[model samples]
Target: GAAYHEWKMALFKPADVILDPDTANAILLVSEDQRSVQRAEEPRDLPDNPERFEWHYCVLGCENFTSGRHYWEVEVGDRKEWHIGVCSKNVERKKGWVKMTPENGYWTMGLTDGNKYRALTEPRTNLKLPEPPRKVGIFLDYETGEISFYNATDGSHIYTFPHASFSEPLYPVFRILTLEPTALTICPIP
Candidate 1:
């Protein structure tokens, strides 16, 4: 309990991060508050703008980070599959399966298939939690060169990416692989 309390005090300074609907795919329905997203069976007829994703299911954060530490959480409610993490603002957004790795400007983790979750690393790491985490916390420290992932449901550390060096600004990225309306919520720290 003290560890979690200390972790929160040290990490969560608070930032108003929201999903940028303009960067979302047509099948990804971003909420009105820009704090949540879900996959739709049919694509919405949104304008095919440059800011929008060409892929069928992903979104970016409205805010970008260049320096300092940042933290945010997402709630993947009863989802069989989902992805969440950070990426460069200029990562590939073509119509195929985009390579989701730090090499491609993404540092993320997600659950796929029926119940498998893993880090989106070059050499992927399979993650088996104590139980399925309902909430996930993402923490970034620019100077320390680390990006830590946490199970926000119980304040447990999941994984950490060391040497997270980058020259460009980073945006939070969310991708869902389910066709049934499974929502990923951007959480606010209390």
Candidate 2:
């Protein structure tokens, strides 16, 4: 009966504090059940394509991978505020928590930091499937996340999740221009 579990740093804090604050809390509580170690026992689903209440503009990070002129956003997976992100080497057999890059010469997602970027051309519409993707999906836990890219026709992309935006952290910086009075209600998603 020796199972291990990772501690979530967000389930205890709000999204606003997560982005603005730049420190860690050690005396923080770990589990609510006190008797159980499993956290987020419920469907604490990561932020999917729908209901991204905080950030805006090209929600997905893959929106940047372009031919140097075009852009597009991949319908990648989502990670909750508390979830963690990591990469691995052999990422085909569902080996690690999140499959980042498999090999060299493959495309990778990106993470947006204070790094300055500019878009001059239109965004990409259709994403070229790496594998024979029948129904691609991404998975995320507290410490690790995975984005499975596959096609029923192609099979698999040399890059597992690639170091693309899909590979970046779900922790995004809030970029709301201005807040209004009626902006507190829950956002609707498709």
Candidate 3:
């Protein structure tokens, strides 16, 4: 429906970071190759000073991240390695999977913030739709680089990097497990 350019990174670096919840709304937390989903009340407005973010869930207000898509890039397992992919927030699992929908309710690929995208799906198929319609109720990719949406799940694939992007350098990353104050904000996603 609308056009939005998500976040973009040239070269992502490495850093030893813990699970931060105050990074942005709809964030992915990694610990042991598994991921945790979190969202925030407001789409943005996480603490900007030290970079505030919370880990909650926002399905209704999720329209902000996607006029017709959702996105973001996150760190997994205290490492900087990133995974990449953009399926409907709630992807129907397929190939390698009995159902097209994930048991967790989202789809993603390997590489969080790196270049060269990989098909994280069995057929790497997009959602089939007639026109542009945002389907991401909220974000749910665990430690990934950019989450995105397309007009049709199978139509013109708009490769908006970051899968999602923030207008400012600040994003509201929420977390299930709370860490130190420096790790994240304690806000809840709507």
Among the numbered candidates, top TM-score falls to 1
lDDT of 1 by residue, 46-77 (tens): 76588887864789989898888888878887
Model 1 has an lDDT value of: 0.81
Q: For model 2, what is the C-alpha lDDT against the true structure? A: 0.21
lDDT of each: 0.81, 0.21, 0.29
Error of 3 at 67 (Å): 0.9
Instruction: Score every model by TM-score.
Output: 0.91, 0.19, 0.23
List candidate 3 stretches off by more than 4 Å.
1-71, 77-86, 89-96, 99-107, 111-118, 124-190
Find the 10 residues in a row with the least total lDDT in model 1: 1-10
Q: Please state the error at residue 22 of candidate 2 in Å.
A: 24
Better structure of 1 and 3 per lDDT? 1
The TM-score between candidate 1 and the true structure equals: 0.91
State the lDDT of candidate 3 residue by residue for 1-190, as single tens digits: 3323212111222111223333333333323322233322335433442222222221111222223223333323332222322234332212233422223333343322323333335455433334322221123233343444332222244433333332212122222222311221111222
Ranking by TM-score: 1, 3, 2
Query: Backbone clashes in each candidate structure, one number apiece?
Result: 0, 19, 45
CA RMSD (A), model 3: 15.5
- Which stretches of model 1 miss by more than 4 angstroms? 1-5
Decide which is better by TM-score, 1 or 2: 1
